[PDB]
Amino acid sequence: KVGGNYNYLYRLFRKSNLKPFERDISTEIYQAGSTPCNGVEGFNCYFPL
Amino acid sequence: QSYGFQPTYGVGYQPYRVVVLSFELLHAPATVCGPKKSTNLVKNKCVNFN
Amino acid sequence: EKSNIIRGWIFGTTLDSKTQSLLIVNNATNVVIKVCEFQFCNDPFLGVESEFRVYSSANNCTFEYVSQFKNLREFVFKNIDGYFKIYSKHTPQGFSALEPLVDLPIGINITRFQTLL
Amino acid sequence: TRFASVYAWNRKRISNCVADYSVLYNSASFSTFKCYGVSPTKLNDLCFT
Ligand SMILES: *[C@@H]1O[C@H](CO)[C@@H](O[C@@H]2O[C@H](CO)[C@@H](O)[C@H](O)[C@H]2NC(C)=O)[C@H](O)[C@H]1NC(C)=O
Ligand SMILES: *[C@@H]1O[C@H](CO)[C@@H](O)[C@H](O)[C@H]1NC(C)=O
Ligand SMILES: *[C@@H]1O[C@H](CO)[C@@H](O)[C@H](O)[C@H]1NC(C)=O
C-alpha cells in the first residue's frame, strides 16, 4: 500500500544447488566471463536480484 | 491493413522476425530428442558402461 | 501366389475420412507408409505403367517411411503398446520362425483391413 | 528470409527426428531468445511428441 521498495528481493541464480541451511549472500552480478554467455564476456551479465 | 516499412523508419517500427516454438506434453511415443554422449571404448579393466 | 497380383494392403480404422488410416503400400523400390487422411471412396485398385488409383484426396499427412513346390510369403501384423509391428518370412507342414522387420511408433487404433489384389 | 504475415502466420510441424538445440542458444544472431516453462539447456535432455 506504501511498502516494498528494492529491499524485499529474491534470487533467480542457478547452476549452484545450495546445501541445507546455507547463506547465499553473494551480492554479485552473475556472469560467466567465458564462452557460455553469448560467446563473449560481459553479455548475459544479469544480477539475479 | 498493410505495414509501412522503410529503412529510415524508427527501431520500434523496424521489422522483426519472431518464431515461437511449442512442444506438446508427453501423451504419445517420443520422436524428437537430442544427442546424448559418446566416448571411446576401453577393455580389460572393470568399468561402468551404458 | 507365384506372382505380384497381390502387392500391398489397406489398413486402419473405419475408413470414412475420419480418425486416421495406414497404407503400408509398396512398389518394389519404396515401401511407402503414409498415415494421411486418404479419402478411400470405393476403389482398392492396384496402380499399374499408367497411374495409381488408390486414393482420391490426401488431407493431413503425419508419417512417412522408406525402405527396400512354391514360395510361401507369410506375414504377421500386431498393434500393441502404441507400436505397430510386422513380421515376415518367405520359405503347409514344417516349422519355421518369424523375424521382425519394422517397429512403427504410430499408436493409432485399427479395426479393419483389406487386400489390394 | 521470406516469412508470412502475422495474420497469416505459417505453421511448421517438426517430429520424427533428432533436434539440436545447441546451435539455437549459442548463436549471437538472435537479439531475443526466451523460453517459458523449461530451461533452454535442459531441453537438450528431454523428448516430446
Ligand atoms: C514408388 O512410389 C514412390 C512414392 O510415390 C515414388 O517416389 C519415390 O519415393 C519418394 C517419394 O515419396 C521420392 O524419393 C521419389 O519421388 C521416389 N524415389 C525413388 C528412389 O524412386 C517412386 O518413384 C515409386 N517407384 C516406382 C518404381 O514406381
Ligand atoms: C488437419 O489438421 C488441422 C490442424 O489444425 C485441422 O484443423 C484439420 O481439421 C485437419 N483436417 C482433417 C481432414 O483432419
Ligand atoms: C483409441 O481409442 C480410444 C477410445 O476408444 C481413444 O481414447 C484413443 O485416443 C484412440 N487412440 C488414438 C491414438 O487416438
From Swiss-Prot, chain C:
<comment type="subunit">
    <text>Binds to host ACE2. RBD also interacts with the N-linked glycan on 'Asn-90' of ACE2. Cleavage of S generates a polybasic C-terminal sequence on S1 that binds to host Neuropilin-1 (NRP1) and Neuropilin-2 (NRP2) receptors. Interacts with host integrin alpha-5/beta-1 (ITGA5:ITGB1) and with ACE2 in complex with integrin alpha-5/beta-1 (ITGA5:ITGB1). May interact via cytoplasmic c-terminus with M protein. May interact (via N-terminus) with host bilirubin and biliverdin, thereby preventing antibody binding to the SARS-CoV-2 spike NTD via an allosteric mechanism.</text>
</comment>
<protein>
    <recommendedName>
        <fullName>Spike protein S1</fullName>
    </recommendedName>
</protein>
<feature type="glycosylation site" description="N-linked (GlcNAc...) (high mannose) asparagine; by host">
    <location>
        <position position="109"/>
    </location>
</feature>
<comment type="function">
    <text>Attaches the virion to the cell membrane by interacting with host receptor, initiating the infection. The major receptor is host ACE2. When S2/S2' has been cleaved, binding to the receptor triggers direct fusion at the cell membrane. When S2/S2' has not been cleaved, binding to the receptor results in internalization of the virus by endocytosis using host TFRC and GRM2 and leading to fusion of the virion membrane with the host endosomal membrane. Alternatively, may use NRP1/NRP2 and integrin as entry receptors.</text>
</comment>
<feature type="glycosylation site" description="N-linked (GlcNAc...) (hybrid) asparagine; by host">
    <location>
        <position position="27"/>
    </location>
</feature>
<feature type="glycosylation site" description="N-linked (GlcNAc...) (complex) asparagine; by host">
    <location>
        <position position="60"/>
    </location>
</feature>
<feature type="disulfide bond">
    <location>
        <begin position="36"/>
        <end position="61"/>
    </location>
</feature>
